[PDB]
Structures are given as structure tokens and as C-alpha cells.
Design a protein around this ligand. Structure first.
Ligand code: COA
Ligand code: COA
Ligand code: COA
Ligand code: CL
Ligand code: CL
Ligand code: MG
Ligand code: MG
Ligand code: MG
Lengths: 120, 121, 120
């Protein structure tokens, strides 16, 4: 097993910063977040989900500045978040015996938060 | 298989005066419990967060009308952990999704309430 | 199974309060938190982890004021923080059939949050 939690300030996401966004979010994630009622809040929630998922893997960090594009949040019933690992995240997870990851997201004025649980 | 849910709520998101909303979304036992706590508004907010967290963990697109959450009941046993009991549409939707169990946890501070639920299939 | 979550204001921890710190944190925890970039935030996160872990055990509370030194958060030769139960926490957990506990911690500048999941 494994568990992850992450909390983010809504203002931590600068929607105007295309470089930051493009480096850390897949085109699909960007399309989803850009279409929500509160775009900044949606990106913040997705960012929290990426971090929560990473923490649940039980692996080593590549460094404070490594992009999280490899951890992709996809949707199920249109809006519910599912996890898809790619690249290094996929390798590291498989190397750790992780067979599945579930995630949930929520936000309010204070911050966005996400919780992930992984199965081995 | 498996499922997870998290929800965060402002304490002020619950208006204890709004009897109509409370009646619609909380069971008599939930209302009785929350009404008896040191901070009533905070307790309702935590219970509300728990209902939302539990719903998100079920992996369903919605409960099947309406949006009311009375069907997801938080049961309390003094000095012990909160527990989940599903009724009505929530129970049907959960069973239809293969959910066999749901655990929940609640926390508050001055600023907000948060709950986390995990479901088993 | 069992789940626990706890959220704390960073300012809820008074680092000056040696009595509170000594009563609730092991020497190892105190050393770790005291060495972090933000000491107050680190203690707050560790406190939240203790609370989250307790909630996941599915046991009765000894009271609002009971010390939590028995629930130790270890990070070191560890990637993710890990849980080690001692004393009464260990007995109570074993008595409840808990065989393992995982925990995760997150901070922003305002608050800390932790989530724990226990296995039976
Ligand atoms: C380590 C990381 C997850 C922490 O993120 P953050 O938002 O800056 O800080 P947070 O307050 O939310 O979390 C820090 C806490 O996470 C936990 N943590 C640290 N490393 C961890 C790890 N390897 N696995 C799981 N949890 C970890 C610790 O509990 C720490 O708190 P503590 O020191 O008080 O015990 C983040 O900095 C990171 O390295 N992400 C991964 C980046 C990466 O590897 N990119 C490659 C793409 S997959
Ligand atoms: C999902 C719901 C329980 C909570 O939504 P919310 O009020 O926005 O509060 P939260 O921020 O805590 O949760 C929203 C998040 O839950 C997640 N989510 C959405 N639908 C979900 C579902 N059916 N199952 C599990 N998780 C879901 C999403 O990640 C969403 O964030 P994101 O879309 O930006 O990624 C539900 O009440 C809802 O979507 N309502 C808001 C929209 C609404 O009220 N419309 C009515 C029109 S009058
Ligand atoms: C129970 C306790 C964790 C609550 O901590 P808190 O930070 O003051 O309050 P929080 O807002 O975070 O959470 C309170 C919620 O915890 C939940 N809870 C209460 N007792 C619980 C228990 N025995 N197990 C799991 N969850 C519990 C309840 O849901 C409560 O909210 P609610 O009454 O509205 O439903 C804490 O007060 C406590 O008594 N710790 C126990 C100390 C102890 O026994 N130590 C010895 C180690 S074995
Ligand atoms: Cl890949
Ligand atoms: Cl019923
Ligand atoms: Mg909300
Ligand atoms: Mg608290
Ligand atoms: Mg953070």
C-alpha cells in the first residue's frame, strides 16, 4: 500500500505562465482545467493530485524542480479524476510494485487538496 | 477496484439556521449529534465534508436524484471513529458499483473542515 | 481497514512550549523538526500525522489532552514518512488488529495536513 496528500494555495498556480503550465500538465489536463468554472482552482487541484499521487508511490524524488507531467490526471465520468503514469513515474511505480493508484480532489478559498492511495 | 474521496469545506459554508437545507441533507441522528457538539457549525461542516468525501469515493457519476446527501449517513460512537451507513439511492448506487465498505475520517480547525473516505470493492 | 485525516494551523504549534513539545514528540522527532527550514511548520506537520494515524487505528480516545509521543513519525533512511507505534498506541493497535499504518504529510504556509490509512 501507499498514501499521498498534498495541499496547495490556489494562487500558487499562475494561469498566465504558459511555460510552467506546459512543463507540468499534459495537453489533456490543460484542456480540462481551462474549461472549468474556476480555471486557476482546477489547475491547483490537479497539481495537488499529481503531488499526492507521487507521495503514495513510495519512491525517490528527482528534485524539487522536476516536472510532474509524467503523472497524469485523467477523467472517468467526465469529471472524476483517475491516474495515468508515464515515463519515469511509470517505471518508478512498477519498480515499487504499484499496480494501481486512486486519487480525489477538492478545493475551497484557502487551498486545493488531493489524496491518493496506491495498491501493490 | 478501490476508491478514494476527499472534501474540504469552509466552516461558514453551513448555515445552522437554514432548517430546510439541514432537514434535507442530514438524518435526525446527524442533526442531533452536531447540535450537541461544542461548536455546532463546525460539526455540521465536518459532517457535510464527510458526506461529500464518501460520495467521491463511490466512483459513481451521481446518486440518481436529487443532489441531497441524506442517504449517506455518518454514524458516531462516543470516543470512537465515525462510521458510514448508506441508505436509499446511495446504497443502491454503491452496491451497483460493487462497493462493499466505506471508511471516513473528519477534522476541523478554526478555518475549515476536511474529510477523507476510502471505499472497498 | 481504517482512515484518518487531520488538519492543523501552523501557528497551533508553539515551539517555545518545551513542555508540550517534550510531552508529545520523541527526541528523534524533535531533532528532525528542529533541523528543517521551517521548524514550526515541521512540528505542525508531525503533529497532524500523529493525529491522522490515531484516527486510522479505530480505537477509543484517552481524552483531548492525552500525549501522542507513542505514535512516532520516522523519516530518514526513508523516502515517505513512516509510522512506528510504541507503548499504549502499539498495544491498542494490536488489540484492534492493525497490522500496518501508512501516513502522508503536506504543508502550505497557512496549514498542515496529514492522511493515514491502516490495515487489519
Ligand atoms: C517531495 C515533494 C512531494 C514535497 O512536495 P512539497 O509540496 O514541496 O512539500 P509538502 O509540504 O506538500 O510535502 C513535504 C512532505 O512530504 C513528505 N515526503 C517527502 N518526500 C517524500 C517521498 N519521497 N515520498 C512520499 N512522501 C514524501 C514528507 O512527509 C514531507 O514532510 P516532512 O519532512 O515534514 O515529513 C515534492 O517536492 C517533490 O519532490 N515532488 C516530486 C518531484 C519529482 O520527483 N518529479 C519527477 C516527476 S515524477
Ligand atoms: C463533485 C461535488 C460532490 C463537489 O464539487 P464542488 O462543489 O466543486 O467541490 P470540490 O472542489 O470539493 O470537488 C470538485 C472536484 O471533485 C472531483 N469530482 C468531480 N466529480 C466527481 C465525481 N462524480 N466523483 C468523484 N470525484 C469527482 C473533481 O476533481 C472536481 O475538481 P476538478 O473538476 O476541478 O478536478 C459536486 O457537488 C459538484 O461537482 N458540484 C459542483 C457543481 C454544481 O453544484 N453544479 C450544479 C449546477 S446549479
Ligand atoms: C480525538 C482527537 C484525534 C481529535 O483531535 P482534534 O484535533 O482535537 O479534533 P479534529 O477536529 O481534528 O477531529 C475531531 C474529529 O475526530 C473524529 N474522532 C473522534 N474520536 C475519534 C477516534 N476515537 N478515532 C478516530 N476518529 C475520531 C470525530 O469525527 C471528530 O469530529 P466529529 O465529532 O465532528 O465527527 C484528539 O482529540 C484525541 O483525543 N487524541 C487522542 C489522544 C490519545 O488517546 N492518545 C494516546 C495514544 S494511543
Ligand atoms: Cl511512457
Ligand atoms: Cl435503506
Ligand atoms: Mg468544497
Ligand atoms: Mg485539528
Ligand atoms: Mg504544498
Amino acid at each position: 500500500g501507499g498514501v499521498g496528500v498534498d495541499v496547495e494555495l490556489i494562487t500558487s498556480i499562475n494561469v498566465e505562465n504558459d511555460t510552467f503550465i506546459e512543463r507540468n500538465f499534459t495537453p489533456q489536463e490543460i484542456e480540462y482545467c481551462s474549461a472549468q468554472p474556476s480555471v486557476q482552482s482546477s489547475f491547483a487541484g490537479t497539481w495537488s493530485a499529481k503531488e499526492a499521487v507521487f507521495k503514495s508511490l513510495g519512491v525517490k524524488s528527482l528534485g524539487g524542480g522536476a516536472a510532474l507531467k509524467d503523472i497524469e490526471i485523467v477523467r472517468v465520468n467526465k469529471n472524476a479524476p483517475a491516474v495515468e503514469l508515464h515515463g519515469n513515474a511509470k517505471k518508478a511505480a512498477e519498480e515499487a510494485g504499484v499496480t494501481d493508484v486512486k486519487v480525489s480532489i477538492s478545493h475551497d478559498d484557502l487551498q486545493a487538496v488531493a489524496v491518493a492511495v496506491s495498491t501493490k
